Amino acid sequence: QALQKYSTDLTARAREGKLDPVIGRDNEIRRVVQVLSRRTKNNPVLIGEPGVGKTAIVEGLAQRIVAGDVPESLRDKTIVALDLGSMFEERLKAVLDDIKNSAGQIITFIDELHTIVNMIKPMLARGELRLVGATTLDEYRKHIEKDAALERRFQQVYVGEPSVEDTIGILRGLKDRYEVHHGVRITDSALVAAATLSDRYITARFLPDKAIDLVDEAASRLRMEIDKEEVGPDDIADVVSAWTGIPAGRLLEGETAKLLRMEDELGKRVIGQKAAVTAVSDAVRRSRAGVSDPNRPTGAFMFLGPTGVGKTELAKALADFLFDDERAMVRIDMSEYGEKHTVARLIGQLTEAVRRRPYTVVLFDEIEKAHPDVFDVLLQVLDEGRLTDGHGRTVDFRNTILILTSNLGSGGSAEQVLAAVRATFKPEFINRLDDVLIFEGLNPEELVRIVDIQLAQLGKRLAQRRLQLQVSLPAKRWLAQRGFDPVYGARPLRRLVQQAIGDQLAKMLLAGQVHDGDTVPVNVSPDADSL
Amino acid sequence: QALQKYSTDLTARAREGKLDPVIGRDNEIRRVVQVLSRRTKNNPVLIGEPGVGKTAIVEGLAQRIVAGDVPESLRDKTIVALDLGSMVRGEFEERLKAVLDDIKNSAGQIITFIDELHTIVGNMIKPMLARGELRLVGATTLDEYRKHIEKDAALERRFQQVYVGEPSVEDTIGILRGLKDRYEVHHGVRITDSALVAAATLSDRYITARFLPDKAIDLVDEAASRLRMEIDKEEVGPDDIADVVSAWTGIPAGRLLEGETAKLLRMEDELGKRVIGQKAAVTAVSDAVRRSRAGVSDPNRPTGAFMFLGPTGVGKTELAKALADFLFDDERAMVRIDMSEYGEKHTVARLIGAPPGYVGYEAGGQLTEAVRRRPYTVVLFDEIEKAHPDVFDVLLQVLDEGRLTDGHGRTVDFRNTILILTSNLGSGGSAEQVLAAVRATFKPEFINRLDDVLIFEGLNPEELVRIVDIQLAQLGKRLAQRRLQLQVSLPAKRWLAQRGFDPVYGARPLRRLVQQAIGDQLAKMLLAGQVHDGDTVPVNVSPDADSL
Amino acid sequence: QALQKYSTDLTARAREGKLDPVIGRDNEIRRVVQVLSRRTKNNPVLIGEPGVGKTAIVEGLAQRIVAGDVPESLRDKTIVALDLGSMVAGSKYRGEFEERLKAVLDDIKNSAGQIITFIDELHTIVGAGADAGNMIKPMLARGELRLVGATTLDEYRKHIEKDAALERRFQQVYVGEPSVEDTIGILRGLKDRYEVHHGVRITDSALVAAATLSDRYITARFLPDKAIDLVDEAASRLRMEIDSRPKEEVGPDDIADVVSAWTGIPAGRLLEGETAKLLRMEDELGKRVIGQKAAVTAVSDAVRRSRAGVSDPNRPTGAFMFLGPTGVGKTELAKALADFLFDDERAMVRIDMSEYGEKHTVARLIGAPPGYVGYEAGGQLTEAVRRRPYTVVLFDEIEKAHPDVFDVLLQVLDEGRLTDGHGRTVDFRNTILILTSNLGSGGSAEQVLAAVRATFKPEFINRLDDVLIFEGLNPEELVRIVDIQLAQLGKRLAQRRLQLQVSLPAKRWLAQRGFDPVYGARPLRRLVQQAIGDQLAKMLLAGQVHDGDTVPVNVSPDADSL
Numbered sequence A: 001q002a003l004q005k006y007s008t009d010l011t012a013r014a015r016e017g018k019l020d021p022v023i024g025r026d027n028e029i030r031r032v033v034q035v036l037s038r039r040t041k042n043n044p045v046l047i048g049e050p051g052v053g054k055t056a057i058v059e060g061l062a063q064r065i066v067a068g069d070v071p072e073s074l075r076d077k078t079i080v081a082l083d084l085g086s087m088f089e090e091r092l093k094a095v096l097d098d099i100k101n102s103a104g105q106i107i108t109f110i111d112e113l114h115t116i117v118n119m120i121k122p123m124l125a126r127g128e129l130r131l132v133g134a135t136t137l138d139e140y141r142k143h144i145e146k147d148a149a150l151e152r153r154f155q156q157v158y159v160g161e162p163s164v165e166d167t168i169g170i171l172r173g174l175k176d177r178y179e180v181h182h183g184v185r186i187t188d189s190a191l192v193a194a195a196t197l198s199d200r201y202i203t204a205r206f207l208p209d210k211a212i213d214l215v216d217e218a219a220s221r222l223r224m225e226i227d228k229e230e231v232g233p234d235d236i237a238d239v240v241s242a243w244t245g246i247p248a249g250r251l252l253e254g255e256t257a258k259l260l261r262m263e264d265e266l267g268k269r270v271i272g273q274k275a276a277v278t279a280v281s282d283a284v285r286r287s288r289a290g291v292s293d294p295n296r297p298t299g300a301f302m303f304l305g306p307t308g309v310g311k312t313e314l315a316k317a318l319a320d321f322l323f324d325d326e327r328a329m330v331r332i333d334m335s336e337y338g339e340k341h342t343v344a345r346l347i348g349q350l351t352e353a354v355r356r357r358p359y360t361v362v363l364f365d366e367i368e369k370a371h372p373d374v375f376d377v378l379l380q381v382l383d384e385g386r387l388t389d390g391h392g393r394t395v396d397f398r399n400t401i402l403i404l405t406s407n408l409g410s411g412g413s414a415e416q417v418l419a420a421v422r423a424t425f426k427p428e429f430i431n432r433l434d435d436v437l438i439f440e441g442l443n444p445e446e447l448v449r450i451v452d453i454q455l456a457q458l459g460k461r462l463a464q465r466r467l468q469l470q471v472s473l474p475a476k477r478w479l480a481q482r483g484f485d486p487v488y489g490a491r492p493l494r495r496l497v498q499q500a501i502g503d504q505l506a507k508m509l510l511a512g513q514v515h516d517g518d519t520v521p522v523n524v525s526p527d528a529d530s531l
Numbered sequence B: 001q002a003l004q005k006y007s008t009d010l011t012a013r014a015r016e017g018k019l020d021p022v023i024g025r026d027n028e029i030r031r032v033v034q035v036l037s038r039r040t041k042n043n044p045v046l047i048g049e050p051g052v053g054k055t056a057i058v059e060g061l062a063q064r065i066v067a068g069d070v071p072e073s074l075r076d077k078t079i080v081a082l083d084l085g086s087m088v089r090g091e092f093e094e095r096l097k098a099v100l101d102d103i104k105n106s107a108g109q110i111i112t113f114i115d116e117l118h119t120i121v122g123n124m125i126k127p128m129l130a131r132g133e134l135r136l137v138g139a140t141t142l143d144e145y146r147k148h149i150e151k152d153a154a155l156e157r158r159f160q161q162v163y164v165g166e167p168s169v170e171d172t173i174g175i176l177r178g179l180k181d182r183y184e185v186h187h188g189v190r191i192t193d194s195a196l197v198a199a200a201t202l203s204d205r206y207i208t209a210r211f212l213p214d215k216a217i218d219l220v221d222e223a224a225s226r227l228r229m230e231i232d233k234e235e236v237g238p239d240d241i242a243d244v245v246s247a248w249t250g251i252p253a254g255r256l257l258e259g260e261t262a263k264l265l266r267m268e269d270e271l272g273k274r275v276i277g278q279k280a281a282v283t284a285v286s287d288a289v290r291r292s293r294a295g296v297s298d299p300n301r302p303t304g305a306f307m308f309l310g311p312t313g314v315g316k317t318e319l320a321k322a323l324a325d326f327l328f329d330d331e332r333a334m335v336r337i338d339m340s341e342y343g344e345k346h347t348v349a350r351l352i353g354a355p356p357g358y359v360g361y362e363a364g365g366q367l368t369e370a371v372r373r374r375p376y377t378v379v380l381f382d383e384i385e386k387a388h389p390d391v392f393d394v395l396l397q398v399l400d401e402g403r404l405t406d407g408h409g410r411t412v413d414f415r416n417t418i419l420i421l422t423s424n425l426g427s428g429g430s431a432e433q434v435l436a437a438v439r440a441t442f443k444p445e446f447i448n449r450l451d452d453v454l455i456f457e458g459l460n461p462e463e464l465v466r467i468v469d470i471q472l473a474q475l476g477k478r479l480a481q482r483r484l485q486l487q488v489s490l491p492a493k494r495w496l497a498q499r500g501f502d503p504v505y506g507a508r509p510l511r512r513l514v515q516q517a518i519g520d521q522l523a524k525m526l527l528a529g530q531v532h533d534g535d536t537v538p539v540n541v542s543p544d545a546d547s548l
Numbered sequence C: 001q002a003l004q005k006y007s008t009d010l011t012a013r014a015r016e017g018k019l020d021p022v023i024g025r026d027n028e029i030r031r032v033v034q035v036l037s038r039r040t041k042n043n044p045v046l047i048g049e050p051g052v053g054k055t056a057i058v059e060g061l062a063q064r065i066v067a068g069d070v071p072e073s074l075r076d077k078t079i080v081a082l083d084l085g086s087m088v089a090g091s092k093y094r095g096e097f098e099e100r101l102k103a104v105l106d107d108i109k110n111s112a113g114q115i116i117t118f119i120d121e122l123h124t125i126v127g128a129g130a131d132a133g134n135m136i137k138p139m140l141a142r143g144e145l146r147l148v149g150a151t152t153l154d155e156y157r158k159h160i161e162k163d164a165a166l167e168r169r170f171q172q173v174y175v176g177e178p179s180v181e182d183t184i185g186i187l188r189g190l191k192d193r194y195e196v197h198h199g200v201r202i203t204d205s206a207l208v209a210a211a212t213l214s215d216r217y218i219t220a221r222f223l224p225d226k227a228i229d230l231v232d233e234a235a236s237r238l239r240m241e242i243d244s245r246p247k248e249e250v251g252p253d254d255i256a257d258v259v260s261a262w263t264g265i266p267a268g269r270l271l272e273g274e275t276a277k278l279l280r281m282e283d284e285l286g287k288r289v290i291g292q293k294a295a296v297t298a299v300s301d302a303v304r305r306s307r308a309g310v311s312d313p314n315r316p317t318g319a320f321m322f323l324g325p326t327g328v329g330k331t332e333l334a335k336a337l338a339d340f341l342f343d344d345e346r347a348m349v350r351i352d353m354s355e356y357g358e359k360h361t362v363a364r365l366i367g368a369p370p371g372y373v374g375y376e377a378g379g380q381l382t383e384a385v386r387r388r389p390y391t392v393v394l395f396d397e398i399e400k401a402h403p404d405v406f407d408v409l410l411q412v413l414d415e416g417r418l419t420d421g422h423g424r425t426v427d428f429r430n431t432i433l434i435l436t437s438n439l440g441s442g443g444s445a446e447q448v449l450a451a452v453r454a455t456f457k458p459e460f461i462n463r464l465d466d467v468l469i470f471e472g473l474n475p476e477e478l479v480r481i482v483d484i485q486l487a488q489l490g491k492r493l494a495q496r497r498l499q500l501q502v503s504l505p506a507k508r509w510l511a512q513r514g515f516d517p518v519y520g521a522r523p524l525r526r527l528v529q530q531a532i533g534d535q536l537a538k539m540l541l542a543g544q545v546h547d548g549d550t551v552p553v554n555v556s557p558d559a560d561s562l
């Protein structure tokens, strides 16, 4: 009985009346009782994630026992925990002496048993103690999923989080826990609104206790700013939003803000490809509202283009818009993932960044550098699980869109491309993706905005010496004349800009007479053009 | 009496009776006794999969020892197990030396027993082993023995492999019916021999991860536990285990009963639930597959080798997908290769990949690599009218005996697959000249080996609202986040027929058109409001487009 | 107190007679002795292939020292069996193994030069690093310690020769495996120890049989212990039989029983029971091949002449090639033979020579040289014969193959040799090679031989035995072929309890249809199935025929009907 200084107790808390009302998980408590009532492979271990309530499952089990629902072999069983706060090995003998002389009626419960697993294992092999456990997936797999001599005594129980409405309904046993400081009146409106905005800041947290973390963050931030008598849903929203957003981020949905337009950056930054851009805009209006399916990447498509049409430019253009930053995208080339020697390297080369900053869109410019094993990797990613890491820490793909702007059948127009797509992408890269689009090559109409943005960039580059260019439409079209060449692309235009303008400009800049502050015009000549 | 700290005593524990009965397996015990009684290369090692009964063999050896059956040379000796988990950077070898010290101080015939020694190895034990003071009964698995106790051993001259594969269904039923009083006393309800047979057979048939001797007892113990917990029908019956195995695997309990005639009788609309029309095709395919399972034909031939043709988009691969969904419990079972780039004489061996050391060797062959794994698939040959006249030699050898040889030298068995050769001949002809065309195009004796050469038929304009309803029933779960329902109107249903058929691609745009139109025209209002999860989401057709 | 917890005493172990009586091997022991006694660098190293008696030489030197049979500067030298696995076991700190080894070295060099040391499997002295196994050099190349060693050639090359400054300090004494007579002498020396360990007797003829049989059949191991293993196994097995089972010695046929129990080869002396089978063979083999009497007696003579002990023990057990018309029974005779002497009609190794139309695909049955894609995989044929070295190899239709595959079996035949990429040889010395063809096919026995003489080359036609010519099918044998096929079908109809009652006109019609003179009996299994099995399934799926009903068949005016 000396365990009172070594271990806590639970068979008396519910008897005296000290407990918390946990509701639900009836099937889980049933599973626990059934597994513990076995001849072999008994004493389960509640596997899950930190902050789901495995302790809640155990205390609910104790409550159910003391109220009385158990079979004959469970006559209240004196359930008891173990305080790891008694730490050396000379005292483990003392705490196990009362379990050895026990008659199998003093079953224990260790929390986070992957720390322990020498001293207890032989006793477990003989079966004088049950030792209900609790651990997490990664750690469980790391420690006791490789020693098959101990997988003989441990039948795992998988636990998930309760639903959103379930958390809402269970919240009524928390009305007085935290908000007893500034006496702000709790309202059911803000209560149901708190967990509603669960993916405004971070999706690494969970529902049952991390929603409470959110609520307490909100209470603290209110009591810090207003130092009102009521809690406000949009105010909790501003709490959770003022850090994944500088002006408290985006407000309520109001899709007319950024996504209805979709071309302010795209249509004026990527000249051409109008059909592809309109199509992907329609696609992201149909998709970017949680309005496609259960947890998918919520975006996947492909389209076609040769060199010199602006595929990389569209990729880097949508970056500054889709999430209003530079790292809103990751572009992966498989110039390394081409053989089976490397398919394991990304499980992980990408995982570091994609887990640290899950605010990026995944890009694979070409599959003419890829292997059919990354095919199955991404297939399992799509709709059959978010991700599985070789170490065990899994990272969801919530704000990631799948793109391929390939030159797969660019020589052909509409039929060769479609046949080559249906062929080269064997595993289901057709049925679960979205539409496959096309490009609109450099056209005499689509050259004016090109030259305009090029000259704008050259000007902002020249602004460090306080020079400005007066570009007239004569030269604006004389360059466009000999810069069409729709086999190579805009790089002839850029090189011609550099040569014609910059070579002479940089000769005269050190030849005097163009001292800083001046302004230079453009004047077409028969074969050249002067400044 | 020195360091009994990190071990057990299977003999002393047997002196009281804590151990189980070990019924059966009376040959491996004698083989172990025989190897343990040599002069050199003694101390055997048991080899088998997990949970087959190696520890059980050692327990039975100890029990026959304590009762008295072995020769006197082995009699009067004890056994000890060892724990590779409680020991294990460094100081593990110090502990190992501490143990082998107690062994050398025993200096007798106190046999040891190590479990999964391929974690240990090395050259620390070999001197002590090749001197005659310890005996080493091992236990491990074949593949790990081959990688750890074969490559760097140099003591493979000291180890003898004993094989224990796994029992059969009958031996497992005997194991169970002998190991029956234990659970009947632990929980205590009742157990029927019918339930034992059901456990063995269901486990063997559906559970493929684990193996018989313990995979079977899991079901019995779980059934007893759940029956005991139910009392919060005083016996466990053969139906009282279908429930447990269904809870385990997923398939409902109705399917996990008679499934050899009850499943052939369902080759009715259970296929037609997925494919619409084509009743002659469905009947012919169903009957052809139904008579192959009878059991009177030669056992080396695929399960079905029919080819069908006609217009595209009329449901030609949908029948294949549905047939794979019903028979093989998966719709990702058809492997589809395009017979358009197999036109040259050099690209015929591209679907095997013949030699070692050449360009395409580790990529296997397109046909043989997809069947060596999942040897229960369905094979489609799109556009067979464009193949070089040497593919047919391979495709004719495969269906004369269900075997083939890939490049690595392996042999793959085709006698559980279903072959299907699509085509598109007869763009204009209905049923009269396409037959002569497909007879003249291919060799005449090649068709003589196939099954029915049934010809698909056009889609009745009446039989298109069927496909429309299938599309809408599928779409009835895309707006499942906010429970927003869908509106239905027969004119709009028959509106998609004309502007979606395009009678040169069958019904290919019936998916893209519907999804783009409705999804895009709705996404705006699904956020703007004007409809919530209590409304039909009113929709109809404008003179030009589909109105909201 | 340092070299007594990290070493045992081989000489003290020899004094109590806990060693074995080394027999022979005087050259190697003399060389070890005369190298162990020079001025500097007196470190011999026994080297050789595994199992040929390298430790026995050192134990013999120990027994000789104890007996006093050595030169004057070797008497009372107390050789010591050092071990390193026990000095590296507990040491996890800076400089904890260094002093442990330094104490041993100081104790060896403290006493006078009488501590001859013995490290077995010395390739393990190269590690211990983290400057280790390297402190020993100054004493090695000065004659301070003697260090008799022993290791295998492969381990030597891999570990020690990478340290060309340390190899210099060792003298290689090459140990080669002994011959059959030397092994017989060794066994005669060691017999009386096994005769005491087990409670049985062992016969000198049994020893001779062990040393001889273990040399023809077990070709992956080496002799001195390859031969002892058989004797040990047979003795233990006979003792296990005598006990526990309610004429007392091992003889030259128990060894045959063991050497056939593993390696599968039927080596022995034709114990009664199968001699009757071998005598009654041309008809027990004729229960499946009708006709071709000349091509069955040849195979039967090969098999009998092989197992009777009169045949060249270094050449395959038969290298026939039989060719003739189409659908005559060539492949079927090969399969019937494989079924006769294996009982598993699919236990043979057949390769389809119609797939070798391209010169480069020979690498399927050879492998790939070092440095190419599939190198450690091996070759199909080589790896198929290395295990189960008793099969029947079959080359079907060997005229479609490019005429450069006729050059590899040019020496597979006539010697039973073939080497793969790794350069190791397998022996086709117990197989039966059979390669069929279809040259001629419409000529007499003279113009069909002229096609062989024009397709193959003289040094290839000269390697193989009888070139058998299969004859044409007589119209009186087709009935028996139909009986064979119908019996096969009936035996298939045994998962039910169906039967058949085929009539004489039915059999005659079946024999008449599908025997065309150009394609032999080829279109007959297909016809039997088409005309019986289909409407036997139809009339079984739709009831009206149930298990038990012996259904008859007749010849109703048109094509056959039930």
Ligand SMILES: Nc1ncnc2c1ncn2[C@@H]1O[C@H](COP(=O)(O)OP(=O)(O)OP(O)(O)=S)[C@@H](O)[C@H]1O
Residues within 6 Å of the ligand: A269, A270, A271, A272, A273, A306, A307, A308, A309, A310, A311, A312, A313, A314, A489, A490, A491, A494
């Ligand atoms: N439609 C376009 N809009 C904007 N820039 C374009 C366009 N077409 C070409 N360019 C420019 O042409 C150059 C080509 O680079 P990018 O288009 O970004 O790379 P890319 O399109 O992937 O070409 P490849 O295929 O890699 S050679 C860049 O300076 C682009 O800005």
Ligand SMILES: Nc1ncnc2c1ncn2[C@@H]1O[C@H](COP(=O)(O)OP(=O)(O)OP(O)(O)=S)[C@@H](O)[C@H]1O
Residues within 6 Å of the ligand: A148, A152, B020, B021, B022, B023, B024, B025, B049, B050, B051, B052, B053, B054, B055, B056, B057, B175, B179, B213, B214, B217
């Ligand atoms: N012949 C047998 N008689 C009785 N029980 C048996 C027999 N064979 C197997 N079992 C049971 O099958 C189960 C398997 O136990 P083990 O023998 O420990 O399995 P294993 O082959 O040792 O694999 P490991 O060691 O767990 S990885 C036990 O419950 C045994 O009691």
Ligand SMILES: Nc1ncnc2c1ncn2[C@@H]1O[C@H](COP(=O)(O)OP(=O)(O)OP(O)(O)=S)[C@@H](O)[C@H]1O
Residues within 6 Å of the ligand: B040, B157, C020, C021, C022, C023, C024, C025, C049, C050, C051, C052, C053, C054, C055, C056, C057, C152, C186, C190, C224, C225, C228
């Ligand atoms: N000349 C010999 N005289 C007597 N017995 C011998 C002789 N040579 C070998 N043997 C015996 O045959 C067996 C060979 O064992 P070892 O000599 O230890 O093999 P080895 O030469 O050490 O090869 P490795 O690499 O150590 S496995 C032992 O049982 C020896 O007693």
Ligand SMILES: Nc1ncnc2c1ncn2[C@@H]1O[C@H](COP(=O)(O)OP(=O)(O)OP(O)(O)=S)[C@@H](O)[C@H]1O
Residues within 6 Å of the ligand: C288, C289, C290, C291, C292, C325, C326, C327, C328, C329, C330, C331, C332, C333, C438, C481, C484, C521, C522, C525
């Ligand atoms: N003498 C025979 N006895 C029994 N069956 C025979 C006989 N001759 C032919 N057959 C049958 O004929 C069929 C084919 O015979 P095979 O010998 O396999 O063909 P083949 O002799 O290899 O000729 P090819 O050129 O290789 S097709 C099989 O069903 C055999 O059973």
Ligand SMILES: Nc1ncnc2c1ncn2[C@@H]1O[C@H](COP(=O)(O)OP(=O)(O)O)[C@@H](O)[C@H]1O
Residues within 6 Å of the ligand: A021, A022, A023, A024, A049, A050, A051, A052, A053, A054, A055, A056, A057, A162, A170, A208, A209
């Ligand atoms: N179903 C539930 N009923 C009551 N409280 C719950 C429930 N789920 C989560 N909780 C809350 O979470 C806490 C228990 O979490 P805990 O089991 O300690 O998480 P973990 O086991 O992951 O460390 C309790 O304080 C409780 O308020």
Ligand SMILES: Nc1ncnc2c1ncn2[C@@H]1O[C@H](COP(=O)(O)OP(=O)(O)O)[C@@H](O)[C@H]1O
Residues within 6 Å of the ligand: B274, B275, B276, B277, B278, B311, B312, B313, B314, B315, B316, B317, B318, B319, B467, B505, B506, B507, B508, B510, B511
């Ligand atoms: N009998 C049918 N039942 C159901 N859908 C059908 C049927 N016939 C055609 N379809 C539909 O027609 C379209 C044609 O696609 P697919 O099955 O791939 O045919 P194809 O072989 O012509 O490519 C699909 O949407 C398919 O569902």
